[PDB]
Amino acid sequence: NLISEKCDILSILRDHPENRIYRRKIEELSKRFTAIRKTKGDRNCFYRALGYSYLESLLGKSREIFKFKERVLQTPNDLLAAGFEEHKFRNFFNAFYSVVELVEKDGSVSSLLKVFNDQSASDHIVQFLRLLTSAFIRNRADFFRHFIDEEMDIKDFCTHEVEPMATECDHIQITALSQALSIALQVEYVDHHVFPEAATPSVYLLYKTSHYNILYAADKH
């Protein structure tokens, strides 16, 4: 499946024999986190992980859901301001928005996970999040241009490394999407620019070999 059920932290070792060199780190994670979900490794897992994990965190939080829904409703304007024609992002927006309404009206983890495990609806959701990232980059080109070579074109970067499905993310894309959606994200690293520890993150991800899974904090008891 695209997004797994919750499993033990220590399952990162017991499975995967490659992972035994990082046993002490995995054991320290096991004291701060209580679970991990696995995402398929298809070059889209940053977008799929962040989008699932963030929408999961909103379940049952009326006022957070309210404010997120209002931001997502403004997203067509970011897209249009970036140069995308309504014609082209429409179906991706609709699919994203329909998961936000599931969150708001259904409110259940199992229905959410069912959308994110449906290849088609889930890839639309990814493609939305990618176009949003690209829009955000392009509308803030004066900032994001400092992250690539001064003779490279930020627009090429969006066209080739952000918009197409199955292009791996890197720090630019993670910074752009998180800022676009106002997500407080903490990335943990099992073993080129680290992400900071967050105050009260809604999403924790575990990074290893350019792949992202989702962590759940035992910030508790």
mmCIF file of C-alpha atoms in Angstrom:
data_model
loop_
_atom_site.group_PDB
_atom_site.id
_atom_site.type_symbol
_atom_site.label_atom_id
_atom_site.label_comp_id
_atom_site.label_asym_id
_atom_site.label_seq_id
_atom_site.Cartn_x
_atom_site.Cartn_y
_atom_site.Cartn_z
ATOM 1 C CA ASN A 1 0.000 0.000 0.000
ATOM 2 C CA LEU A 2 1.070 3.714 -0.397
ATOM 3 C CA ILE A 3 0.785 4.413 3.312
ATOM 4 C CA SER A 4 1.124 1.630 5.912
ATOM 5 C CA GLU A 5 -0.495 0.914 9.232
ATOM 6 C CA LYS A 6 1.347 2.100 12.398
ATOM 7 C CA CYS A 7 4.197 -0.280 13.452
ATOM 8 C CA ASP A 8 6.752 -0.365 16.261
ATOM 9 C CA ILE A 9 9.780 1.855 15.951
ATOM 10 C CA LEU A 10 12.015 -1.109 16.560
ATOM 11 C CA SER A 11 10.500 -2.667 13.386
ATOM 12 C CA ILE A 12 12.919 -0.477 11.450
ATOM 13 C CA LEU A 13 15.665 -2.918 12.721
ATOM 14 C CA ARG A 14 13.856 -6.327 12.901
ATOM 15 C CA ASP A 15 12.747 -5.903 9.276
ATOM 16 C CA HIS A 16 15.640 -4.394 7.190
ATOM 17 C CA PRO A 17 19.074 -5.958 8.056
ATOM 18 C CA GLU A 18 20.712 -3.011 6.218
ATOM 19 C CA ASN A 19 19.596 -0.868 9.183
ATOM 20 C CA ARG A 20 21.692 -2.606 11.937
ATOM 21 C CA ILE A 21 24.605 -0.013 11.814
ATOM 22 C CA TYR A 22 22.086 2.647 13.002
ATOM 23 C CA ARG A 23 20.698 0.506 15.891
ATOM 24 C CA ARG A 24 21.619 2.950 18.642
ATOM 25 C CA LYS A 25 19.925 5.822 16.782
ATOM 26 C CA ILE A 26 16.813 3.717 16.145
ATOM 27 C CA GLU A 27 16.773 2.822 19.804
ATOM 28 C CA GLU A 28 16.943 6.532 20.772
ATOM 29 C CA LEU A 29 14.077 7.226 18.351
ATOM 30 C CA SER A 30 12.116 4.464 20.116
ATOM 31 C CA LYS A 31 12.201 6.538 23.291
ATOM 32 C CA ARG A 32 10.799 9.658 21.667
ATOM 33 C CA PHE A 33 8.407 8.187 19.132
ATOM 34 C CA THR A 34 5.803 5.408 19.566
ATOM 35 C CA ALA A 35 5.125 4.401 15.963
ATOM 36 C CA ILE A 36 6.123 4.724 12.353
ATOM 37 C CA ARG A 37 4.112 4.504 9.142
ATOM 38 C CA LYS A 38 5.861 3.503 5.928
ATOM 39 C CA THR A 39 5.224 5.284 2.660
ATOM 40 C CA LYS A 40 5.927 3.744 -0.725
ATOM 41 C CA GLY A 41 9.314 4.599 -2.145
ATOM 42 C CA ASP A 42 8.267 5.988 -5.567
ATOM 43 C CA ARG A 43 9.920 9.498 -5.660
ATOM 44 C CA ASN A 44 6.622 11.093 -4.358
ATOM 45 C CA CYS A 45 6.806 10.073 -0.685
ATOM 46 C CA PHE A 46 7.714 13.483 0.703
ATOM 47 C CA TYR A 47 4.528 14.944 -0.784
ATOM 48 C CA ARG A 48 2.407 11.887 0.108
ATOM 49 C CA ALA A 49 3.737 11.644 3.634
ATOM 50 C CA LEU A 50 3.484 15.280 4.479
ATOM 51 C CA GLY A 51 0.020 15.616 3.011
ATOM 52 C CA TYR A 52 -1.321 12.492 4.787
ATOM 53 C CA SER A 53 0.312 13.190 8.076
ATOM 54 C CA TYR A 54 -0.737 16.772 8.204
ATOM 55 C CA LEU A 55 -4.403 16.079 7.302
ATOM 56 C CA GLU A 56 -4.357 13.262 9.927
ATOM 57 C CA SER A 57 -3.219 15.708 12.537
ATOM 58 C CA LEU A 58 -6.191 17.962 11.838
ATOM 59 C CA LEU A 59 -8.835 15.278 12.520
ATOM 60 C CA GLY A 60 -11.283 16.526 15.182
ATOM 61 C CA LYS A 61 -9.730 19.984 15.473
ATOM 62 C CA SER A 62 -12.561 22.263 14.271
ATOM 63 C CA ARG A 63 -10.807 25.592 14.368
ATOM 64 C CA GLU A 64 -7.531 24.277 12.861
ATOM 65 C CA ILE A 65 -9.613 22.621 10.152
ATOM 66 C CA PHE A 66 -11.461 25.846 9.620
ATOM 67 C CA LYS A 67 -8.271 27.847 9.165
ATOM 68 C CA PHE A 68 -6.669 25.183 6.890
ATOM 69 C CA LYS A 69 -9.793 25.002 4.720
ATOM 70 C CA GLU A 70 -9.704 28.770 4.275
ATOM 71 C CA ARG A 71 -5.982 28.638 3.185
ATOM 72 C CA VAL A 72 -6.671 25.859 0.710
ATOM 73 C CA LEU A 73 -9.476 27.863 -0.762
ATOM 74 C CA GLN A 74 -6.993 30.692 -1.545
ATOM 75 C CA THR A 75 -4.665 28.261 -3.289
ATOM 76 C CA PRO A 76 -6.144 28.646 -6.717
ATOM 77 C CA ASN A 77 -5.018 32.273 -6.572
ATOM 78 C CA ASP A 78 -1.426 31.279 -5.732
ATOM 79 C CA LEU A 79 -1.499 28.961 -8.771
ATOM 80 C CA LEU A 80 -2.977 31.526 -11.066
ATOM 81 C CA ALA A 81 -0.570 34.140 -9.792
ATOM 82 C CA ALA A 82 2.261 31.833 -10.610
ATOM 83 C CA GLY A 83 1.110 31.406 -14.218
ATOM 84 C CA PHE A 84 -0.866 28.164 -14.092
ATOM 85 C CA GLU A 85 -4.138 28.178 -15.981
ATOM 86 C CA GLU A 86 -7.302 27.195 -13.974
ATOM 87 C CA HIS A 87 -8.000 24.743 -16.695
ATOM 88 C CA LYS A 88 -4.878 22.731 -15.866
ATOM 89 C CA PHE A 89 -4.791 22.614 -12.007
ATOM 90 C CA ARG A 90 -8.570 22.269 -11.549
ATOM 91 C CA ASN A 91 -8.860 18.510 -11.211
ATOM 92 C CA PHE A 92 -5.880 18.482 -8.820
ATOM 93 C CA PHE A 93 -7.330 21.163 -6.715
ATOM 94 C CA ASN A 94 -10.713 19.442 -6.590
ATOM 95 C CA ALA A 95 -9.141 16.207 -5.397
ATOM 96 C CA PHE A 96 -7.205 17.995 -2.670
ATOM 97 C CA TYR A 97 -10.164 19.954 -1.580
ATOM 98 C CA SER A 98 -12.292 16.808 -1.430
ATOM 99 C CA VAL A 99 -9.806 15.251 1.079
ATOM 100 C CA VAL A 100 -9.975 18.421 3.165
ATOM 101 C CA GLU A 101 -13.814 18.090 3.201
ATOM 102 C CA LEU A 102 -13.413 14.409 4.216
ATOM 103 C CA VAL A 103 -11.366 15.623 7.120
ATOM 104 C CA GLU A 104 -13.929 18.192 8.040
ATOM 105 C CA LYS A 105 -17.094 16.035 7.600
ATOM 106 C CA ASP A 106 -16.081 12.409 7.907
ATOM 107 C CA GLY A 107 -13.280 12.992 10.434
ATOM 108 C CA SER A 108 -12.019 9.413 10.422
ATOM 109 C CA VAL A 109 -8.509 8.069 9.978
ATOM 110 C CA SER A 110 -9.677 5.075 8.115
ATOM 111 C CA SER A 111 -11.472 7.081 5.365
ATOM 112 C CA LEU A 112 -8.372 9.361 5.032
ATOM 113 C CA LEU A 113 -6.055 6.469 4.695
ATOM 114 C CA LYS A 114 -8.330 4.910 2.201
ATOM 115 C CA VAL A 115 -8.060 8.002 -0.043
ATOM 116 C CA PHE A 116 -4.281 8.120 0.336
ATOM 117 C CA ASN A 117 -4.050 4.423 -0.468
ATOM 118 C CA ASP A 118 -6.148 4.781 -3.658
ATOM 119 C CA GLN A 119 -3.504 5.106 -6.375
ATOM 120 C CA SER A 120 -5.534 7.553 -8.440
ATOM 121 C CA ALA A 121 -6.894 9.972 -5.795
ATOM 122 C CA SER A 122 -3.607 9.814 -3.946
ATOM 123 C CA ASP A 123 -1.515 10.762 -7.047
ATOM 124 C CA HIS A 124 -3.837 13.654 -7.764
ATOM 125 C CA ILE A 125 -3.319 14.795 -4.267
ATOM 126 C CA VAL A 126 0.507 14.528 -4.848
ATOM 127 C CA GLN A 127 0.243 16.412 -8.131
ATOM 128 C CA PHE A 128 -1.714 19.216 -6.399
ATOM 129 C CA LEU A 129 0.888 19.524 -3.640
ATOM 130 C CA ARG A 130 3.603 19.646 -6.356
ATOM 131 C CA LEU A 131 1.916 22.388 -8.327
ATOM 132 C CA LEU A 132 1.327 24.305 -5.154
ATOM 133 C CA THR A 133 5.039 23.983 -4.306
ATOM 134 C CA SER A 134 6.027 25.150 -7.727
ATOM 135 C CA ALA A 135 3.599 28.157 -7.548
ATOM 136 C CA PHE A 136 5.027 29.084 -4.212
ATOM 137 C CA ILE A 137 8.527 28.890 -5.556
ATOM 138 C CA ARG A 138 7.805 30.884 -8.657
ATOM 139 C CA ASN A 139 5.831 33.650 -6.720
ATOM 140 C CA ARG A 140 8.798 33.917 -4.343
ATOM 141 C CA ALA A 141 11.538 33.617 -6.934
ATOM 142 C CA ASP A 142 13.568 36.430 -5.318
ATOM 143 C CA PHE A 143 14.046 34.240 -2.265
ATOM 144 C CA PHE A 144 14.341 30.780 -3.840
ATOM 145 C CA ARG A 145 16.786 31.816 -6.477
ATOM 146 C CA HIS A 146 19.433 32.051 -3.720
ATOM 147 C CA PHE A 147 19.261 28.284 -3.475
ATOM 148 C CA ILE A 148 20.463 27.319 -6.925
ATOM 149 C CA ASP A 149 23.230 28.709 -9.161
ATOM 150 C CA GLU A 150 22.870 32.374 -10.058
ATOM 151 C CA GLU A 151 22.974 31.467 -13.822
ATOM 152 C CA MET A 152 20.297 28.736 -13.427
ATOM 153 C CA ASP A 153 16.688 29.673 -13.998
ATOM 154 C CA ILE A 154 14.283 29.137 -11.038
ATOM 155 C CA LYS A 155 11.500 28.467 -13.599
ATOM 156 C CA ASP A 156 13.417 25.515 -15.053
ATOM 157 C CA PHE A 157 13.906 24.226 -11.657
ATOM 158 C CA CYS A 158 10.097 24.297 -11.075
ATOM 159 C CA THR A 159 9.279 22.765 -14.435
ATOM 160 C CA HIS A 160 11.723 19.919 -14.085
ATOM 161 C CA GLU A 161 12.293 19.168 -10.384
ATOM 162 C CA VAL A 162 9.015 20.175 -8.729
ATOM 163 C CA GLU A 163 6.024 19.782 -11.080
ATOM 164 C CA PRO A 164 6.482 16.271 -12.611
ATOM 165 C CA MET A 165 5.375 13.222 -10.662
ATOM 166 C CA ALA A 166 8.277 11.018 -9.511
ATOM 167 C CA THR A 167 10.868 13.733 -9.047
ATOM 168 C CA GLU A 168 12.606 13.550 -5.713
ATOM 169 C CA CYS A 169 12.280 16.468 -3.357
ATOM 170 C CA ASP A 170 15.162 18.205 -1.620
ATOM 171 C CA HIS A 171 15.447 21.081 0.761
ATOM 172 C CA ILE A 172 13.939 23.690 -1.617
ATOM 173 C CA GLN A 173 10.784 21.739 -2.149
ATOM 174 C CA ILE A 174 10.351 20.871 1.544
ATOM 175 C CA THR A 175 10.878 24.479 2.556
ATOM 176 C CA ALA A 176 8.453 25.698 -0.172
ATOM 177 C CA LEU A 177 5.578 23.308 0.603
ATOM 178 C CA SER A 178 5.843 23.639 4.334
ATOM 179 C CA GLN A 179 5.787 27.422 4.070
ATOM 180 C CA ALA A 180 2.935 27.313 1.517
ATOM 181 C CA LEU A 181 0.691 25.411 3.858
ATOM 182 C CA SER A 182 2.098 26.832 7.097
ATOM 183 C CA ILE A 183 3.091 23.414 8.362
ATOM 184 C CA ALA A 184 5.352 23.054 11.442
ATOM 185 C CA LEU A 185 7.407 20.008 10.463
ATOM 186 C CA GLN A 186 10.195 18.182 12.268
ATOM 187 C CA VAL A 187 12.407 15.829 10.214
ATOM 188 C CA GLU A 188 14.349 13.166 12.069
ATOM 189 C CA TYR A 189 17.422 11.700 10.434
ATOM 190 C CA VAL A 190 18.313 7.973 10.812
ATOM 191 C CA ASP A 191 21.973 8.654 9.957
ATOM 192 C CA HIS A 192 23.326 18.921 2.578
ATOM 193 C CA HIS A 193 21.142 21.066 4.951
ATOM 194 C CA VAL A 194 19.391 19.622 8.056
ATOM 195 C CA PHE A 195 15.903 20.799 9.076
ATOM 196 C CA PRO A 196 15.512 22.371 12.519
ATOM 197 C CA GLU A 197 13.764 20.952 15.533
ATOM 198 C CA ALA A 198 10.233 22.438 15.858
ATOM 199 C CA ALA A 199 8.368 23.868 18.895
ATOM 200 C CA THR A 200 5.020 22.175 18.392
ATOM 201 C CA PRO A 201 5.105 20.426 15.043
ATOM 202 C CA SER A 202 2.045 18.938 13.611
ATOM 203 C CA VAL A 203 4.096 16.451 11.473
ATOM 204 C CA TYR A 204 7.207 14.395 12.248
ATOM 205 C CA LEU A 205 9.008 12.589 9.370
ATOM 206 C CA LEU A 206 11.834 10.185 9.445
ATOM 207 C CA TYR A 207 14.403 10.620 6.787
ATOM 208 C CA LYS A 208 16.675 7.842 5.478
ATOM 209 C CA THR A 209 18.242 7.411 1.914
ATOM 210 C CA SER A 210 16.187 10.177 0.418
ATOM 211 C CA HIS A 211 12.924 8.561 1.663
ATOM 212 C CA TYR A 212 10.415 9.882 4.208
ATOM 213 C CA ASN A 213 8.249 7.864 6.594
ATOM 214 C CA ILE A 214 5.902 9.274 9.245
ATOM 215 C CA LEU A 215 6.654 9.286 12.984
ATOM 216 C CA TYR A 216 4.168 9.625 15.952
ATOM 217 C CA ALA A 217 5.520 11.229 19.127
ATOM 218 C CA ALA A 218 5.296 9.591 22.501
ATOM 219 C CA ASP A 219 5.554 13.111 23.872
ATOM 220 C CA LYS A 220 3.893 11.570 26.896
ATOM 221 C CA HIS A 221 3.639 9.270 29.904
#
